[PDB]
Amino acid sequence: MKEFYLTVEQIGDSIFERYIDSNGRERTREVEYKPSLFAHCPESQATKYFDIYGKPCTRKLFANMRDASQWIKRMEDIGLEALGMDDFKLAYLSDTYNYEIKYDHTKIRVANFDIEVTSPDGFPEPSQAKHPIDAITHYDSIDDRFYVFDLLNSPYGNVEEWSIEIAAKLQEQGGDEVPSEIIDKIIYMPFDNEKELLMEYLNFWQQKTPVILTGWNVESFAIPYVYNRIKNIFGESTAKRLSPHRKTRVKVIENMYGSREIITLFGISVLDYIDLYKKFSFTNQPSYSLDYISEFELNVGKLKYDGPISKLRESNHQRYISYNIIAVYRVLQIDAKRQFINLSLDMGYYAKIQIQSVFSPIKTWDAIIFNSLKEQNKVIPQGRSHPVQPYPGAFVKEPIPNRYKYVMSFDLTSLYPSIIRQVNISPETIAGTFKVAPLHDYINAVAERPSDVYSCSPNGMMYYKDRDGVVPTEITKVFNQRKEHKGYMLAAQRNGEIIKEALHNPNLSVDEPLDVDYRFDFSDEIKEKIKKLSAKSLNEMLFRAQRTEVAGMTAQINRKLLINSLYGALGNVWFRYYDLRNATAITTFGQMALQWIERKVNEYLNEVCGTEGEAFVLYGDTDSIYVSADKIIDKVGESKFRDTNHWVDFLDKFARERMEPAIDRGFREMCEYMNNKQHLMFMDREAIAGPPLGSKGIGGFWTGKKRYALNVWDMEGTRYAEPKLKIMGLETQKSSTPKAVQKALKECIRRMLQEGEESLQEYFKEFEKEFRQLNYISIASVSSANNIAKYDVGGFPGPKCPFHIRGILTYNRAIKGNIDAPQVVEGEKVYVLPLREGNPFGDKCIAWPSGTEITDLIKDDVLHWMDYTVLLEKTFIKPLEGFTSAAKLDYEKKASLFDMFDF
DNA sequence: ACGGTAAGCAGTCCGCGG
DNA sequence: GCGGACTGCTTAC
Ligand SMILES: *P(=O)(O)OC[C@@H]1CC[C@H](n2ccc(N)nc2=O)O1
Ligand SMILES: *O[C@H]1CCO[C@@H]1COP(*)(=O)O
Numbered sequence: 001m002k003e004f005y006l007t008v009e010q011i012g013d014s015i016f017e018r019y020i021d022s023n024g025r026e027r028t029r030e031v032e033y034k035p036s037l038f039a040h041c042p043e044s045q046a047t048k049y050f051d052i053y054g055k056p057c058t059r060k061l062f063a064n065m066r067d068a069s070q071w072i073k074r075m076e077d078i079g080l081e082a083l084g085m086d087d088f089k090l091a092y093l094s095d096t097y098n099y100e101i102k103y104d105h106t107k108i109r110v111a112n113f114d115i116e117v118t119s120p121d122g123f124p125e126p127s128q129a130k131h132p133i134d135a136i137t138h139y140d141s142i143d144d145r146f147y148v149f150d151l152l153n154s155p156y157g158n159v160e161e162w163s164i165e166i167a168a169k170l171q172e173q174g175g176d177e178v179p180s181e182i183i184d185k186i187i188y189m190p191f192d193n194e195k196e197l198l199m200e201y202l203n204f205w206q207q208k209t210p211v212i213l214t215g216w217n218v219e220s221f222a223i224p225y226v227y228n229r230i231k232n233i234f235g236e237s238t239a240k241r242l243s244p245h246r247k248t249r250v251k252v253i254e255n256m257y258g259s260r261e262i263i264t265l266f267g268i269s270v271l272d273y274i275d276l277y278k279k280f281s282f283t284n285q286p287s288y289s290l291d292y293i294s295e296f297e298l299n300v301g302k303l304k305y306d307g308p309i310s311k312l313r314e315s316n317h318q319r320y321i322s323y324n325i326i327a328v329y330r331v332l333q334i335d336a337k338r339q340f341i342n343l344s345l346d347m348g349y350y351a352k353i354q355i356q357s358v359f360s361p362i363k364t365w366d367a368i369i370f371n372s373l374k375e376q377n378k379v380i381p382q383g384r385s386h387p388v389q390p391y392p393g394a395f396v397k398e399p400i401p402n403r404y405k406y407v408m409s410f411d412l413t414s415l416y417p418s419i420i421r422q423v424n425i426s427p428e429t430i431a432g433t434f435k436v437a438p439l440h441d442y443i444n445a446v447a448e449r450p451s452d453v454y455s456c457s458p459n460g461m462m463y464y465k466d467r468d469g470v471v472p473t474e475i476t477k478v479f480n481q482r483k484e485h486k487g488y489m490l491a492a493q494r495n496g497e498i499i500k501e502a503l504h505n506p507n508l509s510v511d512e513p514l515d516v517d518y519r520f521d522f523s524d525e526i527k528e529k530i531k532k533l534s535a536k537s538l539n540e541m542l543f544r545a546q547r548t549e550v551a552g553m554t555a556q557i558n559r560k561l562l563i564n565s566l567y568g569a570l571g572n573v574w575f576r577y578y579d580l581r582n583a584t585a586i587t588t589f590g591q592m593a594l595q596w597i598e599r600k601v602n603e604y605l606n607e608v609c610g611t612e613g614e615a616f617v618l619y620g621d622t623d624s625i626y627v628s629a630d631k632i633i634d635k636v637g638e639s640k641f642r643d644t645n646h647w648v649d650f651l652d653k654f655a656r657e658r659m660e661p662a663i664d665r666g667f668r669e670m671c672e673y674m675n676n677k678q679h680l681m682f683m684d685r686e687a688i689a690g691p692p693l694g695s696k697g698i699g700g701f702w703t704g705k706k707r708y709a710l711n712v713w714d715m716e717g718t719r720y721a722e723p724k725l726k727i728m729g730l731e732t733q734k735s736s737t738p739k740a741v742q743k744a745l746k747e748c749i750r751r752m753l754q755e756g757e758e759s760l761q762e763y764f765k766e767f768e769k770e771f772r773q774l775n776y777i778s779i780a781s782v783s784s785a786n787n788i789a790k791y792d793v794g795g796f797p798g799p800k801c802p803f804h805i806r807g808i809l810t811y812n813r814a815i816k817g818n819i820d821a822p823q824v825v826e827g828e829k830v831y832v833l834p835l836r837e838g839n840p841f842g843d844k845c846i847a848w849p850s851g852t853e854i855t856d857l858i859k860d861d862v863l864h865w866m867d868y869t870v871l872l873e874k875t876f877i878k879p880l881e882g883f884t885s886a887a888k889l890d891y892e893k894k895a896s897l898f899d900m901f902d903f
Numbered sequence: 904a905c906g907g908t909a910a911g912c913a914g915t916c917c918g919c920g921g
Numbered sequence: 922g923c924g925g926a927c928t929g930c931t932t933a934c
């Protein structure tokens with residue numbers, strides 16, 4: 001096994017590094033690192049080193065890191081470039097590890113913890129930590145154990161020991177239903193006072209110190225709470241022992257009337273799961289409680305308990321510890337599914353950065369390009385300052401809102417990284433500029449070729465074709481990796497189901513799994529000898545091809561993530577390599593590209609069909625276009641169309657054998673027109689959509705920009721046995737529209753696309769009649785609640801207050817007094833409802849925290865003055881009206897043909 | 904501090920008004 | 922008094 005780093009930090013002139021060594025042991029070393037930076041120099045005095053612009057550079061070596069920083073400061077105050085890596089950690093890692101780091105994650109301590117704090121007044125603020133910590137569960141990946149510390153005596157009660165035996169037992173008999181596979185894994189530890197508990201915990205931490213610290217909301221609550229709790233009782237020095245180097249920073253807080261803040265524990269790497277999830281789920285949640293994320297991710301229910309949680313330790317201690325145990329486990333279950341931690345680790349070791357820097361695409365990419373440039377003795381630019389000037393982006397086809405019966409979309413492959421490569425965009429490849437004509441003029445091939453010699457973008461930028469550019473080179477390196485490991489992940493399943501069918505063959509002679517690598521596709525040398533194997537080494541030949549299928553997935557996905565994260569880096573002013581003109585160059589080119597192929601598609605289908613200037617491209621957004629395929633269908637007619645599968649075949653055959661070639665011909669001209677280095681605009685078909693054959697369904701409708709629905713039968717050649725609704729943007733896609741309403745509109749949209757107007761009407765008629773029976777939560781609205789405390793004027797609202805904040809502050813005024821009632825948290829979400837006329841509240845609406853049931857004390861009331869008539873019209877009818885107006889349908893008989901006008 | 908474009912909504916504004 | 926414009930905040934592609 002080879003060496004790799006665990007964590008790294010700069011403290012003064014020292015780098016403090018934790019690492020795994022030659023033999024698998026973790027260690028700490030302090031290195032009084034001597035860094036290098038670079039300055040320009042005469043031609044003559046040329047070295048081995050050059051900047052990316054190809055300019056000769058003198059290497060300066062510094063006694064310490066402070067001296068380096070003092071030099072950058074001196075060079076600034078002069079006005080000369082100070083080149084090289086100014087994050088000396090990235091330089092430390094780059095020097096210490098010149099090679100593909102290969103981590104073994106079983107050697108990395110990843111801690112998973114949660115704490116409980118009984119608090120009879122407010123939510124317990126972690127910056128004051130004024131209430132005792134009465135339970136901690138701490139799971140340790142090296143040990144594979146849940147370490148439970150349980151306070152038995154506290155100001156808020158004395159309670160007997162938790163029992164594991166009772167905890168393992170079922171729901172229906174006073175048991176907790178702590179799952180069977182972890183029960184044998186819990187190390188229970190009771191305490192008669194809080195100082196003893198905290199002291200033992202600090203000791204534990206000393207000997208089992210996390211490299212990677214995770215959990216749920218652990219960064220904004222748990223870590224600062226224990227830190228501050230310990231600090232408040234023991235002193236700063238004691239609480240510093242949470243850091244393996246006894247250094248912490250307490251970062252400048254956000255105050256208005258509360259008081260809250262984040263602690264940095266040097267030498268630990270904190271990935272809060274709530275943050276890994278908000279980064280890597282790409283699905284927006286109505287609430288962000290662990291409670292609500294589990295029922296979503298894992299399909300495990302409520303975490304039941306009679307009575308409020310502040311009386312939970314007192315009333316039911318046994319379930320209290322158990323729930324804190326299940327809390328830790330539930331993260332661990334999500335990470336088994338999601339593999340977010342391993343993703344982060346895989347990213348961070350590829351880039352050679354602190355694992356916690358995966359939350360930054362700028363730092364990840366900075367590091368990747370730095371390593372790549374170093375290994376060729378090149379020198380990175382001084383990261384300069386730039387004014388946050390807004391450039392223009394992807395303009396969007398404004399669609400005629402309407403029904404659209406037959407639709408097939410096509411998609412540009414990784415548009416933006418493809419553009420950088422094709423045009424060869426990079427700081428140092430800028431060649432000059434040209435007279436730019438209006439964009440329509442390029443899109444239309446009217447303006448003259450921008451250049452015979454350089455590679456151009458319609459914003460005016462020219463680039464060298466003869467170089468090939470720091471940035472394009474780097475993306476290309478990653479694309480080819482993303483295709484390398486795709487042959488080692490989709491080949492790790494070729495090794496699985498081929499050992500999965502050899503499992504028929506059992507055992508009669510002792511064996512051990514064969515020594516040939518999984519990063520290759522097997523042949524015939526071991527073909528009849530994976531058969532004559534035993535059925536115990538067949539189980540071990542399934543540990544490994546499954547552990548490349550995951551690593552090959554996790555690594556490649558990390559490349560896909562790397563590829564799409566770049567543009568964001570490139571357009572961001574803090575990026576070493578940003579350049580406004582290049583960014584604009586990228587977008588402006590995309591926009592051209594997308595409208596170019598628009599005109600190319602419309603030109604083509606008009607010649608094929610025998611027709612002049614009729615629109616086929618009904619919409620376009622950034623990388624896709626959506627073509628109306630009605631006239632393609634109607635050029636054969638419903639007939640000799642056997643069944644639904646028959647016309648979809650037709651459209652699949654048509655796009656692949658005819659359209660796609662013309663698109664290709666179209667983009668090649670565009671390449672020649674702009675004289676790009678390389679043609680990389682690869683547009684092939686995405687979705688095929690329409691109504692079931694022989695039906696009254698409408699297949700699709702657009703409402704406006706970014707708001708549409710399609711009945712899809714095929715996605716990239718994967719034909720569905722049942723049609724999939726591709727709704728993009730409508731209320732059923734929104735986190736703020738109620739659930740029961742999210743359902744109804746989906747069923748409405750389904751009925752429109754697949755069945756009659758008759759069936760839409762039958763359903764609308766019924767959802768109305770059954771509305772009052774619905775669950776008050778399933779029919780409540782949702783919004784983020786930002787700046788509550790701006791419109792908050794003596795309990796009431798002042799000038800310009802939103803609806804959602806109105807609700808927040810008629811709540812604040814209803815619960816004024818009752819402490820065991822949740823107070824809306826600013827930045828978090830709120831569930832909203834409307835109240836009617838002479839209500840006992842004061843204003844029109846009421847909003848309470850999302851995820852939750854409203855305090856018992858007003859829940860019964862709010863189920864009397866609830867405005868369902870306004871709530872039905874607001875959340876259901878208004879949006880339905882939108883769809884049907886667009887689709888040219890009615891949801892109700894008797895509807896007038898006039899209106900939809902103005903007279 | 905670690906990309907633009909655009910929706911739909913509820914509040915208010917603005918100019919034009921017996 | 923009137924209704925379209927513009928603002929402010931969400932949350933979408
Ligand atoms: P839509 O009709 O699904 O098309 C999606 C396109 C792709 C780029 C652009 N987009 C989507 C999502 C985010 N977050 N940012 C974007 O620019 O819309
Ligand atoms: O514009 C920002 C937000 C999304 O892309 C960039 C990310 O840069 P940073 O490294 O978070």
Ligand SMILES: [Ca+2]
Pocket residue numbers: 411621623624
């Ligand atoms: Ca798309």
Ligand SMILES: [Ca+2]
Pocket residue numbers: 411413684685716
């Ligand atoms: Ca594709």
